[PDB]
Amino acid sequence: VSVLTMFRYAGWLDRLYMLVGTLAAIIHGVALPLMMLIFGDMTDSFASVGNVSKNSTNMSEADKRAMFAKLEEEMTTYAYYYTGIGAGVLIVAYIQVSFWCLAAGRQIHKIRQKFFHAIMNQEIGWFDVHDVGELNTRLTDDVSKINEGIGDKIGMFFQAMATFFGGFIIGFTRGWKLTLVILAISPVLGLSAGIWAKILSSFTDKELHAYAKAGAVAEEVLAAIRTVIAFGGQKKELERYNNNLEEAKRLGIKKAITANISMGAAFLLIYASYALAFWYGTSLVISKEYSIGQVLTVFFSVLIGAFSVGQASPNIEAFANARGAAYEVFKIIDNKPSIDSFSKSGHKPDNIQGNLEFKNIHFSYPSRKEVQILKGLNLKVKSGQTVALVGNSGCGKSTTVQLMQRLYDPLDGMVSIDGQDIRTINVRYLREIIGVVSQEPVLFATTIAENIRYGREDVTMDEIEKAVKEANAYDFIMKLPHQFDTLVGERGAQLSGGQKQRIAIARALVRNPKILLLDEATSALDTESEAVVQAALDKAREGRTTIVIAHRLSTVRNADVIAGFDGGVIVEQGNHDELMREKGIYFKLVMTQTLDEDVPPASFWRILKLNSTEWPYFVVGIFCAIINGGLQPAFSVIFSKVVGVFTNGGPPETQRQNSNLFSLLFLILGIISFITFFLQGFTFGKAGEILTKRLRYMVFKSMLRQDVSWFDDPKNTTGALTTRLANDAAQVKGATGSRLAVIFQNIANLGTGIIISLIYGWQLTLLLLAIVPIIAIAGVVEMKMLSGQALKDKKELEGSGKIATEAIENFRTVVSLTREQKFETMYAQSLQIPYRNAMKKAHVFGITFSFTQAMMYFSYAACFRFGAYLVTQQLMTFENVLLVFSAIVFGAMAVGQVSSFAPDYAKATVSASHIIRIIEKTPEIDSYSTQGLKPNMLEGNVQFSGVVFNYPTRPSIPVLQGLSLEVKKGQTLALVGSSGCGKSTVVQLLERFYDPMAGSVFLDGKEIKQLNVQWLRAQLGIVSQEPILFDCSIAENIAYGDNSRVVSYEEIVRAAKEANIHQFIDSLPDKYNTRVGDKGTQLSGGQKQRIAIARALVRQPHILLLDEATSALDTESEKVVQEALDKAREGRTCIVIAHRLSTIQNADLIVVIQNGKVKEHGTHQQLLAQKGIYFSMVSVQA
C-alpha cells in the first residue's frame, strides 16, 4: 500500500507500459537459460560426432557423410539458435530499458512539481522546524533515489526471473531427478558459499566501523593553525594517535581484509567445492545412468541461476532504499498538512479600509513548551495612524507584528483587521493587503526591474519608476550602470544594505497595501543612510495605516501612539508625552538610551614511482599474484579437459578420468587459490598499511612545516584538509593494490590466454581476440555515454535546483506570497527542458544496452559456428572449443578485474596526485640558522624599513605601501589606523608570516628576513582578537611547550600570577588540572585571553604583540586585562595595536598609520596638538 502503491503511483499508459516492458524482461532472463539448453543440444550432437570420430578405425566415407551431415545440421541449429535468442534479446532489452525511464521518468517529473509546490505550501512550518537547507537537499537527493528505485527495479524483475525460470526450466525439465542431483548438490553448495561469505563479509563491515573510530581518534583538532605556528608544531601527538589506532585497526581490518581475501578464498574454495560435487556427482550420473556428457547443460545452467539471485539482490536493495526513504519523505511530500494557513479561496474583503484589532490574544511559538509570549494582548489601532511598538528584551513585539500577517495563528483570542477576523479573510488577498518590510532587505539574483516585478507581477516600468521614485531610489539606480535592468550579482551581495532595504520598500510599495509594518527595517544600518531610509518610510506611510517596531525612539517620536513592550509585557500606550509624563517604561527606556578542489596537473607513472618508494618491497606480492593469473587459466583448461575426455575418448577409465580431473580442478583451484589469495592478502595488505600510515605522517608534517599564504590565507579549510588526510592516504593504498592486480590479470589472461592461444587452432585465436577487444570497447563506451548523460543531466537539473533553492531557502517570499506558483512555474520551465531531454536519453540507454546484448549472442554464435566449421571425416574442429572458453572467459577475467578490487584507479590517482604535490610542498621556514641568538640580541628595537607588502592576492593593491616604523626597547609602541588590515598585517610581518614585497625589519640589529625564523618566533608575545587553545589541561595550555620549554610548574604558576587568571586557578574543581573542558566551551574570553597572556609571559617574550587584544569584553575583565597587560609590558618592548582610542594615551609612541603609509606619530597630546587625523579620532571618540 502507501509504501509500495503510493510509491508506484500515477500513470495510465505509464503503468501499462510499465507492465509490458516488464514482460519483456522476464522473457529475457528466461532467454539466457533456454540459452543453456541450446548449450546442451549442440554439445550433445557434438559429443556423438566425438565418439563416431573417436571410433575411427573403420569406414572413412561413412565418416565423411555422418560427420558432415552433423556439421551443416548443427550449423543450421546454430543460426536459428542465436538468431532467435539474439534478435529477441535486442528487442526485449530495449523495451524494458524504456520501462525504467519513461515510467520512472514521467513519474519523477510529476513527483517533482508536486514536491516543489508542496514544500512551498507547508507554510510557517518550513520555518517552524526543518533545517531548510536540509529540506531542499533531500528534494534533489530523495527524488533521485526514487527514480533509481523504479529503473533498477525493472532490472530486478528481469534477473529475478532469469534465475527463477532458469533454475526451474533446466533444473527440472532436464533431469527429472538428475536435474535434481543438481538441485541437491548445486542449491546446497550455493547455500554454503553465500552463507559463510556473508557472515564474514558482515564481520568485514564491523571492521569498517572499528576502522572509522580509529580514524577520528586519529583526526583531532587541526584548525587554529595560525596560533599553532606562533607555537611551532605538535607533530608527535598527531602521529601518536594517528599510526596508533591506524596500525591497530589496520592489521586487524587487514585481518578481516585478509579474511575477505579469506572470503574470496572461501568463495573460490567453496566454488572449487562446486567443481567437486559438480563433476563428481556428474561423473557417476553420466557414466552409469543418464549418459549424455550433456548434464553439464543443466547443472552449469541452474548454477547460473543462483547468480541471477545475487544480482537480483542488489537491484532489490535499490528498490528498497528508493522505496523507503522515498515513500517516508514522500509522506513528508504528498502530505497536505496546510490548514494553519493555505493559498486557496477564502473570504474576500473588498471594503478596502479598516482598523487593526488585537482582542485578548494569547500566543506561544510553535515550539510547544515555549512560554506564551503573548499572555493575552489587547491593542487596537485606528486607520491612517502611525502606531509604534517599543521593546528590547526580545520577543513579543515582532511576534505580534507577525501575527498581523496571519503568519502563525493565535493560541487564543482574536485579531480583527478592518472590522472582520483576519483568520476569516482570504490569505493571499490578506497578505497582499499587507505590505511589510522586515529588516533584512532580502533581494534576488535578478534585475531590480525584477525584484519589483516580484513585488507585483503585471506592472509597467512606468509604475515601477514612480515606485522606486517614491521609494526614493530613482537616483542611485540611474547612476548605477545598466539602469533598472541591473542585476544583483549572485544573491543580494553587491549594493549597500541601505539601498537594498530601499528597493524592498519600492517593492512592497508597488504592492501598495493599506496596512504597513516595519520590523525595525531601519535597524542594523549606519546613521545617514538610516535617516534617508526613514524618510522613505514616511513618504510611504501616513497614506496607509501603519505599525512599526523600533529602538530608534527618535523615529518613534512622531508616533501617533506608542505601545509599551519589553520581551513580552503589554503596558503603557498613548502619545509620546503621555508615556514620558508616565515616568514608566517608554519614558524609562528613552532615558536609558539617552568544498571544491579539483586540480588538472595529474601524474603519469609519477605516482607509481612515488608508489614504489612508499613501498619497501613485496615481490612476494606480485609473485603470488602472477601465479593466481596462471590459476585462472588453469581452471579454464581443467574444465576443457574434463568435458573433453568425457565427451570424446576411450570408454574404460572414463571414471578415473572424471574422478581425477574433478579432484584435480578441486585441489587445484581451491587450494592454490585460498593460498594465492590469503598470502597476497597479508602482503599487499601490509603495503596498504604502512603506506597509509607513513603517508599520513609525512603529509601532515609537510603541512606542519608548511604555512605562509597556505593557512594564513587559505581557500583550504580544516575539513578539506583533514579529509585530504583520510581519503588520500586510502587512495594511494589504492595505486599500490592496483598495480598489483594489474600485472596479475595481465600475465594471467595475456600470458596464459596466449600460451593456450598457441595450443589453439588459429581460428579462435584471431576471431576471438577480435571479439574480446570489440565487446570490451563496447562496455567502455557504454559506461562513458551513461556517465556523460548523468553529468550533463545533473547540470540542467542543477540550474533548476539552485533557483528552487533561492526560493525555499528564502521563504521571505511567502512574505508577499505573490509568486509561490509563479516560482514553481518558472521551475516547470527549467524542468520541462530536462524532461523532454529525459525521454530522449531514456531511448538512448535503451539502444545502448540492447546493443550490448547484441554483441553478446552475436559474438558467441559466429564464434561457435565458425568453430565447428569443417568436421567432415574428422577435421581440426573437435573438443578444443573449450579452449575457446579459455580465451573468451579470460576476457571475462579482465572484466572481473576492472569491475572488482581496488577503486577504478581514477580517483585513487587523483587523491594520489593531490597528496603528493602537497607532501612535496616548499617548506618556506623551518630549521635554518640566520643568527645564533647571541647573548646580545636581548634588545628588541624593532625596525621597519620600506615595509611594502600585500598577502598573496597582490592584485588587491598592497595594504602596506612604502611603510617604515620603529620601536625602541622595553617600551610601548602604540598603533592606530583606519580598521581591519594594516595593524594585523604589521604584527604578522614581524612574525614574518609573509616576508614583505620590498623592505625588511631589524629586531634590534640583524635583518629579520634573514634572521632565524624559528627563534624570531621564540621571542614573541602575540595576543590577537579571537583567543584559542586546544583541549588540553590549562596547566598544559599555560605551560605552552613552545620548544624545550619543559612544563615548568613554578614557572606556569608565575604565569597565572601575572596573567591574572590565578583567580580561577585557585579554586575551580581540580585547580590547575582543569582541562579546557569540551574543547574550551566552558569559559569567558577574559579567562581564555588571560591564559593567552599566561602563554605570552610564560614564554618571557622580549616583544609583545597586542592585536586589539580585548575588543569584545567588559568590566574587571577589560580592567584586569589592561593591568596584567600593564605589568606584563613596560618590562619589555611591546607593540600595542588596537581600537582603544581610550587607553591608547598611555603609550610611549602612538603611531597613526593610514593603510599603506604612516601619517602621524608621537606623544598623545602632541598628536592632538596636530589637529586633524589623530585629532578627529579623539573627537569622533567622544
Ligand SMILES: CC(C)[C@@H]1NC(=O)c2c[se]c(n2)[C@H](C(C)C)NC(=O)c2c[se]c(n2)[C@H](C(C)C)NC(=O)c2c[se]c1n2
Ligand atoms: C562478473 C561475473 C563474471 C561474476 N564474477 C565475479 O563477481 C568475480 C569476482 Se572476483 C572473480 N569473479 C574472479 C576473476 C578472475 C574474474 N573469478 C574467479 O576466481 C573464478 C573462478 Se571459477 C570462475 N571465476 C567462473 C568463470 C566462468 C570465470 N565464474 C563464474 O562462474 C561466475 C558466476 Se557470476 C560471476 N562469475
